[PDB]
Design a protein around this ligand. Structure first.
Ligand SMILES: N[C@@H](Cc1c[nH]c2c(Br)cc(Br)cc12)C(=O)O
Ligand SMILES: N[C@@H](Cc1c[nH]c2c(Br)cc(Br)cc12)C(=O)O
Ligand SMILES: [Fe+3]
Ligand SMILES: [Fe+3]
Ligand SMILES: [Fe+3]
Lengths: 239, 233
């Protein structure tokens, strides 16, 4: 039942939206610089997410049409890592450090789940047919939209106050994620018309469970990082 | 029993040993500082190799005996990333930079195969039985031993000249690499399907290692002046 899979995604989304980290990020009584304290944590993810789209999801030598739809989808998501680096500099988090200090930060044990999220997604997606890969992408995009709907609230506050163009923790990022390329069909529209077998349904349920459990593990690391570095607020500069 | 697989590993090793990068690293007529120009490239691998042993290979919740032998083997290999960071500082490569520059370096397109080698190994090993995981580990350890037999030649030269204790590009690292996995493979009978999969494993591991070494060669050519800068005691 693909109707049950897409509703399972909504059920997982509704539970995921209630995590304490998002209540903190959406709280406008706290300065947006303190709500974006978790921003450096995304460095263990953002470029690994670029590689996930470049090299794991994508298969340019494929003739299958559903794979080509996945390929078109990766072309958009593989651009967002430069947006992350754009806002990293604007937030005053692109700090100078020793090369090994940058390595120890990315591979910190406190960012374990953040760093291996795309890795675990790639392992889960490797032996899947294209329509089952779409379930992974749809669940992953659903969790990501919950995150960036929240992060865009302090990001757009800093962007208007400092008069700087933010690209990652911004509404334009959310709107691009919500939409899709002109001329291509929606992955969700393809899923709504797809009939799954009993074996596919069991694998699809496992996919949704794992994607949101791993996203929840990541968000837990964001919370603990904010608690452990509560003074390391963002330091943007006005234009 | 599995003699063809262990011989295939030996054939791939002998072919792998002849790559031009290793001839460059073993040439003592070139200063060891110039032969270790490729050392920063390992930043895209060494810590990913730590995670590979910690989280992909290792399975502490397993009762299988072959998996426990893998778990013990990962406890040694998961320590070597700190050795890499040690020799990184000694060689004068632990330089100061912006956070994004370090990110752009690791995820450089010129280090693609270096960066995703452990990732591709993990993807290959995930659905394998423990004895088949051992085939992956054995081929990977054989290629790594060819790498560090070579790098230890200029590394020990700098270690002797500067009287500093190197840990990664050093003989002590090679000696640790050299309950055995190899003994289990010799006593294991594979099915026809298992043997065919083991051939695929060996081909992929050494092909991916060859791509990594190819990136090391192009990096040395592109940064021929950025020789190591170690200091004497
Ligand atoms: N829109 C995100 C993609 C994304 C998708 N899912 C995500 C999760 Br779960 C956590 C984080 Br942090 C990021 C994502 C990006 O462009 O990097
Ligand atoms: N002895 C290496 C492990 C290793 C095993 N295989 C390797 C290959 Br192929 C390339 C490189 Br660079 C390193 C390895 C280490 O501890 O980092
Ligand atoms: Fe995005
Ligand atoms: Fe090692
Ligand atoms: Fe080893």
């Amino acid at each position: 039942m693909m109707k049950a899979i897409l509703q399972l995604i909504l059920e997982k989304r509704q539970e995921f939206e209630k995590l304490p980290c998002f209540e903190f990020v959406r709280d406008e009584t706290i300065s947006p610089e303190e709500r974006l304290i978790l921003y450096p944590c995304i460095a263990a993810f953002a470029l690994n997410f670029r590689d996930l789209n470049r090299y794991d999801y994508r298969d340019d030598n494929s003739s299958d049409y559903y794979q080509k739809i996945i390929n078109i989808h990766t072309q958009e998501d593989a651009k967002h890592w430069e947006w992350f680096l754009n806002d990293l500099e604007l937030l005053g988090f692109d700090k100078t450090m020793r090369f090994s200090e940058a390595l120890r930060f990315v591979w910190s044990d406190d960012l374990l789940h953040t760093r291996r999220l795309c890795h675990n997604i790639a392992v889960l997606s490797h032996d899947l047919e294209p329509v089952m890969k779409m379930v992974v992408i749809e669940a992953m995009e659903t969790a990501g939209l919950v995150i960036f709907h929240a992060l865009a609230k302090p990001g757009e506050s800093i962007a208007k106050a400092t008069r700087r163009k933010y690209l990652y923790v911004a509404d334009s990022h959310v709107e691009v994620e919500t939409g899709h390329a002109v001329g291509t069909e929606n992955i969700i529209t393809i899923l709504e018309q797809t009939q799954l077998s009993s074996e596919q349904e069991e694998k699809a349920k496992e996919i949704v469970n794992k994607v949101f459990q791993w996203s929840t593990n990541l968000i837990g690391e964001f919370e603990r990082y904010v608690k452990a570095h509560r003074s390391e607020k963002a330091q943007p500069t006005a234009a």
